[PDB]
Symmetry: D5
Subunit: 91 residues, 10 copies
């Protein structure tokens, strides 16, 4: 699932790939579940969709913390913007 | 680009969809660029790919902070795991 | 996200569609996470990937149980095969 | 059809992959068929579509049972929720 | 799932479409299952795969007979070639 | 275009794959052409579309006979339903 | 199957779209069948594949003639290059 | 980009594949551009789109002539139908 | 082809969408033709592929110029980097 | 991610491939972000989307300048059309 041949990729690059596509898949699941929660017309299904939705956010956060500990630029930019106040574009 | 009809989705659900697919696309770009950075055999191109790569991480971080500010469970789970030490699964 | 126009689909068909597509996506996440667990060369990442993997199995089982309660034929066939011993093809 | 090279995957991982994608494909067929059953305006076709639909559930159930027998946490989590009463999120 | 808008398609064209895509999907399942049957290294799984495989052929055959009964050229061409002997291109 | 590596597939399996994918593509063309025939507002084009459509059916029927001759379960199930009368789900 | 909404498209444009996509699908079948013909290890199947292959070329040629009759620039460029000798880039 | 492994394909088959997929891509560009021409509400863009469209037809015709010179059935079938008069299905 | 409903998109956004997607498709064609030029083993075909390739670049440049003239930020950023000589990341 | 096998492609072809798909992805991001800016009903999100949008144009422009410096026909055709006056077609 990589775009370049594995023999020219550094191991750390490939591990970061694994982490990044995981976050991508978690975000997609968050998004789809939230849409299904709004549209669902069954209360028992809605409670299940909403529970799964919010656990995906936890999955994403864990993997994003791993990216942060293993990439100086993820560390730098996440530190600049996360948990701030005032206009996000002026930080 | 939504899986459910727009008329049954809450406004904040659609705006979070816009933000979430944006973060997904930034992540994809990070990964793609980093792979091309490893495989490139032209250092002038490599310099452009790496420059672009790291700005995508900033675009992702900005959008993630917006999500964090506009979604309680994103705020909760990001607070739990980001900028921690020790085992990520037990934070 | 349906193959037929929503206005000819019964309400229950559309809810089962939401549940079915959720189980599909969970199964896919299990499989992909398990492959990344095998291939990962970073122990902290591996711990995270395996943690998320097993929670997707729980998201799936919760949704399958909803399908079972809301579809007589799922109930019948799941009852026949799940939690049995001996040859599966002979139950 | 795997995302990681086969030489780094354990045999058991690959067999579970085969089962898992089988279940996915059965689920998809159940959903597709059910929608076509609702939309179809020919009763003879509808009968075929519905027949096929419910046999895919059986295909899915059989494959899922194998998965369950060959993966400890599938077995654990399915045991928690399947054939229960009261709120599923509990 | 139609290539043309439903509002210009005749009802019977749309029903034949439902049948054709059904057969297409069955054929795909037969093929994927057979490939998994050859590659599987667990005999209990292999037996299930083979079982499912052969029932997809029956799903296809039922739907093909519906097409034969509802389309005169399907009827003509299936009668010319199916269950014949000697060279297929010379029937 | 196979989901499993070629080195573990039997030769006959790969040939059936060639046949099956051919039939799938013929069916897709039949369907696509029939929709275009319905939507077309040019009679000369429609005539071409309809002609091509019905020849795809012949392409499919030929390849389907090859499968019937080379796969016992295709022979069995095709024989149960094809050229029959009364309700198909029986 | 169009990229723009049908009500902004001229009728004739939509009919040329039907013809063009038909030719595209015929070309694809020609290519795939030809590849299957080279790879097949069953002579009887190969004869069916080659027979079908060459009839796709006729389906394509027929539809292409309609295009030529209904589009002045198709007529111009097909006239310039088809059935010529010497270097194609110098026709 | 081939469906069969390159080692079982004849060189000529692969060159024909390169030409066929080129024509397919040209036809797709012709169609897409023609749709954007009808839909555009900017005349300067429209003139560019129309210009590109008609040059794609030329690219297709050139490549189609190469196929004709390198494939007996293309030569046969193109000769039968192109630049004819009266009903196309009857040449 | 758009990701948001057309009725919420400004007319100029939609026209820029048409141009942007045209450039993307032109770039794609340049890349694929260039790959086919390298791999082709028939010199007559290679000459056609190379000719078409280089015309796609002209199609892209024309459309890129339309974007330059109709979008302030494209104009600003293209002006900064196009037709320069020093190291690209420092302009 | 190439359509031809890497061992038949020149090094320069593959690096141009890396730049071109990068430009394509940048163009796609510009378009998607621009559509989201129009549709967004959250002004704080809109400002992030617009910021990111315009930085993608800069990423594209850098990469495009690299292509211009490494491909004689890109340089020739870009020089013909960019930053010109009068009708784009007649330049
Ligand atoms: Ca997913
Ligand atoms: Ca992208
Ligand atoms: Ca390992
Ligand atoms: Ca059975
Ligand atoms: Ca399927
Ligand atoms: Ca049965
Ligand atoms: Ca096709
Ligand atoms: Ca009509
Ligand atoms: Ca294209
Ligand atoms: Ca200068
Ligand atoms: Ca250079
Ligand atoms: Fe998850
Ligand atoms: Fe970005
Ligand atoms: Fe999940
Ligand atoms: Fe099935
Ligand atoms: Fe089936
Ligand atoms: Fe055909
Ligand atoms: Fe055909
Ligand atoms: Fe072209
Ligand atoms: Fe072009
Ligand atoms: Fe970018």
């Amino acid at each position: 699932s990589t775009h370049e041949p594995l023999e020219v990729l550094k191991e750390e690059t490939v591990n970061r790939h694994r982490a990044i596509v995981s976050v991508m898949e978690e975000l997609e699941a968050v998004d789809w579940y939230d849409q299904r929660v709004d549209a669902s017309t069954d209360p028992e299904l809605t409670a299940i969709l909403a529970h799964n939705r919010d656990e995906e956010k936890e999955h994403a956060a864990m993997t994003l913390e791993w990216l942060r500990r293993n990439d100086a630029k993820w560390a730098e930019h996440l530190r600049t913007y996360l948990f701030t106040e005032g206009p996000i574009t002026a930080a």
